[model samples]
Target: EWKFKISEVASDLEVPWSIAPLGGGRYLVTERPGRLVLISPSGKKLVASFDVANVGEAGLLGLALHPEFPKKSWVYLYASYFAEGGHIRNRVIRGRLDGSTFKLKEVKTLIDGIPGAYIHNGGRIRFGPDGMLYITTGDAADPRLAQDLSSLAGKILRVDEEGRPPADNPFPNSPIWSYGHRNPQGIDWHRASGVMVATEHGPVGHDEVNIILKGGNYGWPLATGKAGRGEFVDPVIDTGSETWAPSGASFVHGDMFPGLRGWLLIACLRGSMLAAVNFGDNMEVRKISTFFKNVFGRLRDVVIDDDGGILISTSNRDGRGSLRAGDDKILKIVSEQH
Candidate 1:
């Protein structure tokens, strides 16, 4: 068992949505109005901010530093773009950071034109251990699109740095890594078994933690929480959407968490809690428990840092929480056993 204490690192943020840790006590956060703000170690000074395009659930939703960042000096962003025909599209762009300033050097369209709805625009990015860029997308609230193979919406995409399909993709010339996700908010690669996993939001019930398989279909509208059956792959574990709005996830303690070794820690939005899924040797969920709770309101993302502490981003500015002076914060939780 573990205990949690919330610390307010920064406050008065304008709809701060996502967070990425930069080494040396620095971290980056995305503001809803198209600015990427860098927070200092002590979370005092605003190191830098960059311009972005802000739209409904669109403005600068994801941020990731190149795996070889600083040395490679590359950064990536996912934001909504106003396109022709009055259509809004989500795109990924790469930039370079010099000192504290980031210069937009290149822009590539990983996938586009899947139709953009006001809600359910899933946006999360992480690079896998194989060095391929992995992105999570939403169904744009269109149930039909979840089954569309050609549509990029409602899917997890795998692409090269240049936004091209990797040769090893399960589907020939297809960039989709997995499909049938309602609104996948978080993705990570499991180091022990070398598999990718994703967490998704369900409409009312059927929130899911999925093992992302190459070209595997997750059966959204047709299946709900191991139900609605039609040959769809069942989720490793499913929690009703009311009690659990699972979000971002990470592994902790290497082999120490017992029953949870190589397991995944997930964040809950509606449940307002942090949870752990115990994956035994067979990579199946043996048990699930709430690890931390009550201190956060609508948690959005979570990452495990080099020092073995957990860093979580709060989404209080999303019109839900009682915003304290520094409500929007990046909280660090250390293991007591460590």
Candidate 2:
């Protein structure tokens, strides 16, 4: 009987960060240097690859399926692009997927002008249960930008499929869902409660696990831990001195693993582990566990498969980890027990 296990879906990748399923046993993955790939179930066929602007922390990052895929026929992406004066900006766009050829068609730019930098460029996007597109951005290595309402940097942004802010947005006419974050990389929806959650990088110390809120401030430079001032929301789970560099979080669906059903799993880069957190009925964190530490060095993203399995991308070759034979890779994990 097997509870949890890990296997390689595909190896010899560059630096894969995100995985978006294509319904029938196919997945599109985003690599750091801007390559979109379609990986087959067998892990041998490299279905497709596309070029992207590979910058420092701003390369091809984040992938999400259109709420109505195949019908909507849209695959959303986030990556860095150069503008006037040689300034690079983080941008979001959508394109149609062309079968086994791997060509993106009907490409459309949705949002751009998000700040960019050598580090701290948050790049995580996904569709919420409400069908709204949620985007995460970084502070561009500046503390003040996190608290600035005018800037899209350092915030979780909410928008419609056509790149427009919803009418019900908290702000009068803004796309920002929340502000005051350093570099949030992990975001997922709570399965039981439907609450949106996120994980962020710390300042050499103090990583955070937070509930994404509309019109809420997550105090970055102003405060690290709980502000206790009511102005800033504190993280539910804070690693005070330990840094996880948490990224690409997802909630277990289909009740896959017995103990991990409905729990939130965070892929950690710096710690080289897959962190799992359990919450009480009230949604408060109860316990935390980890797996594959150093076994799958520098995990970047995790995706739940249709059969309740998992596909994760490794970041060992991202200049941070010591590379083995196949520096970066995508892993397929399944429960051994039927």
Candidate 3:
């Protein structure tokens, strides 16, 4: 068994969504209402800000760096903006970061035209080990779009850093790698297994942790939780009807928590907890446990440090729980080596 310690790394952030660890013991965090900030190494510095459309569930979201950073320090982000004809849409952009001065330059939009809505606007973007940018998209409350191959809604997209689809993609001229996801907010690459797993938001219930596959169908509108429809892939852990509302995930590999090594540490929103789920071969789940229930209100995202420490972001002050001295915070989790 592993016992962990949690501490405060940062506080007073407003709706921080994603965290990307940087070189030189620093980090980049995105504040959902269109703020890019660099944390640590100094006080929080505002790198850049945009006029993001902060509608329902839409706002500034996920962040990731180029696989090759510092030397090629490219920072990427997924955000929602007001489009023409009075609608909301999602977009991905990349830029060269100069954290020393908290300035961003040479910014360019990589991908756009993704549908967005008040809820279910999946906005988690991560770069896979294969050096490909993988982004999760929600059906935007219209479940039928998940099954429509012509639409990019409710799908996980894979593209080069330049936002171009690779030659090996399942569909021609499409960036989708998998389909049928509802509101997937978490996507992390397993260090040991090299498998990419995603955490999705369910309909008041049925949150899922799924092993992603190329061209795999996750059975969105047509099915929920083990559809057994023969073509759609089932989730690794269904978690029954409880609303985990998982947001971010990363695999544990450090000796600091021997029992948790290789298990996935997932951050939950509405559930107000951090879940540790053990995955077996062939996407089987071995164990499931939650920690810090209601201790930190409405967790949003989680990231592991190079030194084996865990960093989690909270969303209590984002119109949910009671705001403390520091409304929102990024907490650090630690443990002694076993």
Candidate 4:
């Protein structure tokens, strides 16, 4: 058995989309309005800013620190910005963080030309166990694009540290690892099984949790919920006629909570809860339980800390929910007793 305690770590944030621990109790968080805030033991301060569009859901969304972290001093960000001809597009960029000054410098673009829109700019990036960056992109509100491999929209892209696709990718010199997705936001790997799982925002009320496989096609424009067809892969779990708007996901592990190890914790925006999922052998979902429903308004991201604590970011200020006193904040959940 495990007992957990919840506490607030930071508040007054504006749509904090992602939070990354920078070691030493310091964290780097991204605000949807194009700012990067560094939260430390003392306080939070603005560390960097990007030229993001900041229109609707198109802004600074995903942030990740290199696996090597401070040793590499590398950080990554995903955002949507206006390009030539007034087109809204999404891109991934990396910069070096000056540890002494807490400022991000030497920013450079890694990937570009991803389709973007006010609604579905699926922006989430994380490094998988293979030491490759995996990027999730939306269909830009165009369902047809989900089936088009030529477009970066509606796909999970895998690239090296320099933002180049590995030679073993499905396509030659292409970043796309898997295709046929609408707007997948959260992705994480199971440490023991090496299985990858993803959370996708489905159309209307068909939200899905899918077991992502290499070069696998997750039917979007063609099928959803339970396809049951062999051609297009079906979801491991689907929210039929319900919307979770699931964002960031993390597989719980660590000695602090032995019972919770390998359970996937997903933050929900519309469901306003933390959905804990347990999987059985062969990637079968054993159980799914939700906590903190309507307690945080809109949860954006959930990441685990090095000390076996879980940190979740709220998105109450995302223009879709009623603002609370703090509007947006990062909440911490730590195991009390086990």
Candidate 5:
């Protein structure tokens, strides 16, 4: 029962991939062209920018501030690095903020040897409540990799802040938390039940939202929708063929927005819509609805802010859509009651 008002915050970005709020009237965004731009509350100053490797879907794709942030000043980044023999690889590094400048303090290779494709290099990261880092990786458009136990592609992996497998992980020595994903774009933990949920892209039809269980197989390539083989958990909600291309999702107010509390707000890349999926206590989606349709093209990520408003990023500059006057923007959805 909420309406959306799209606002153009900035433009001419080289494909803004992900955005993170700095908690104090400032925001940081990653452009695929190897720069992390910081925006002030008034939306005036550019603040700061960092150098990164911009290559294919592997550039500056994901960013996360340390839980202690300002005190510890740690920031994490996922990007492709230029290596020997003109080869490139995906890597995650940490940087420490020093006033207006940032220092690359540590570079840890959590999972390496992932083939870099121009597309389908799933790059999204989030910290679970258990204080572990969770990453979503793409199959690099190679279907066989999804089923490979030793491969890091097309799977959701969990690791410690130092990039080591936790001792209590379902798989004793494996960094993988869940397998069988095509190109998962979004991942978040449910605050209430403490369960992990991810959004994935489908080849033709069968885009899915899956609950990430410990050591569970999502049944990609071998299955579609809720119909698979023996022990594969199905998606709570599946959108067949029209290609919703769901991305970053988050849960809103716990009780204030009853219909939206446990609901997941998903950004659709191709369908050009923001969808809400309501789940019961049992974690089953009881209803699905669409919000903000046809108004914004190729929405990529959505985040619920501290003030209860939602921030959405449009991905129209990634060689996909015809650029308009202000083609890329970060929209703020406001409620009348506010």
Candidate 6:
């Protein structure tokens, strides 16, 4: 069995969207309002800032460190900004982190021209086990874009470190790995199985946890949840009429949480909880449960901390929830084996 204790790591954040746990007792958090806050062993400070289109859900969103991290010193971020044509668009950029000061420099845009809107600007970037950078993009409120192969709107795109589409991409010379995703925000790979899983927000209801397959179609506008058939793939875990508003997800891996070594921890916004999901050997949903429902208001992201604990970010200040004493904070979940 496992006993868990939740503690506050930091407070006074403005919609802490993503938490990147850097080793050696340090963390990097991206605030939706375009601030990159670094939490070190001693203190917390803003290390970088960007001019993002902080309207609605569009802003500085996901952050990922290169697999080689400190050695590579590359930090990648996804942000929505006003393009030259006076339209909001999303792009991925990388910057070199100064090891001594933890400051970002030599920033450059890798990919650009992704559709964006006040809503559905999906922005979750993660480095997969294959050393490829995988990006989750929403349909930008255009459900049709989810099925449009030419648009980079509603899809999980894979690219090389330099933002070039791999030669083996599903679509010839395209960065799209999988299509037909509405607004997928969280994605992670199972440690032992190497299987990819994603959490997607449905239209009104029908939130889903999908076992992602390369080159697969997830059935967006034409279907939701279990409506997928034929050429489309259905989700493994579907919330028929309910909503989790799931965001970032991470699979338990280390000894700190032995009992949940293969479970996935997902952060919930509308449901206001941390959900732990267990899958059977065949990748079937064995069990799903939420811990501390409504205790943290709204959650934006969850990640495994450097010390093996779980780090989660709050999103109460995102103009949706009733703010608590600490409107937005980063909470750490430490598990004790019994």
RMSD of 6: 1.3
Estimate the TM-score for candidate 1: 0.89
Q: Give per-residue CA lDDT, model 1, range 73-123, as digits (tens).
A: 777777776668755667777767665454345455555654556677777
TM agreement with the true structure for every prediction:
0.89, 0.95, 0.96, 0.98, 0.91, 0.97
Winner on TM-score (1 vs 2): 2
Give the range where candidate 4 is weakest over 10 consecutive residues by summed lDDT. 1-10
lDDT of model 6 at residue 6? Answer: 79
Regions more than 4 Å wrong, model 1: 4-6, 42-55, 100-111, 228-230, 253-261, 336-338
RMSD for each of the candidates:
2.7, 1.9, 1.6, 1.2, 2.5, 1.3
Model 5 clash pairs? 138-154, 205-241
Per-residue lDDT of candidate 5, residues 236-329 (tens digit):
7778766798888877663234446767889888878899888888787788898767777788888776565677888887756656567677
Q: What lDDT does each candidate get?
A: 0.73, 0.84, 0.87, 0.91, 0.75, 0.91
Question: What tens-digit string does per-residue lDDT give for candidate 6 at 65-158?
Answer: 9999889999999999998877889999999999887789999999999999999998999999999999999999899999999999999999
lDDT: the better of candidates 3 and 6:
6
What stretches of model 2 exceed 4 Å from their correct place? 42-52
lDDT per residue for candidate 3 within 1-338, as digits (tens), equals 55767777778999889988774557789998889988885678789998888878888998988888867878989999999997889999999987466689999899988988988889999988899999999998999998888988999999998999999999998999999989999999888778999989877888998989899999988888776677999988886777888998988876456667778999999899999988777547888888989888889998888677788999876686667679698987878442
What ordering of candidates by TM-score runs from best to worst? 4, 6, 3, 2, 5, 1
Clashing pairs counted in every model: 1, 0, 0, 0, 2, 0
Model 3, residue 230: distance off in Å is 0.8
Candidate 4's error at 280, in angstroms? 1.0
lDDT of 2 by residue, 1-338 (tens): 22667777777888888988665667788878877877777654443354555767778899888888767777889888776787777899988876546678877789978988878889999999899999999998887999999999999999999889999987879999998899999899987788999999989878889988788899987988666778899998889888888989998886457567878988999989989888888778988988878987899998788788877888987888888778688887878763
Off by over 4 Å in 4: none
Please say which candidate is ahead in TM-score: 1 or 4: 4
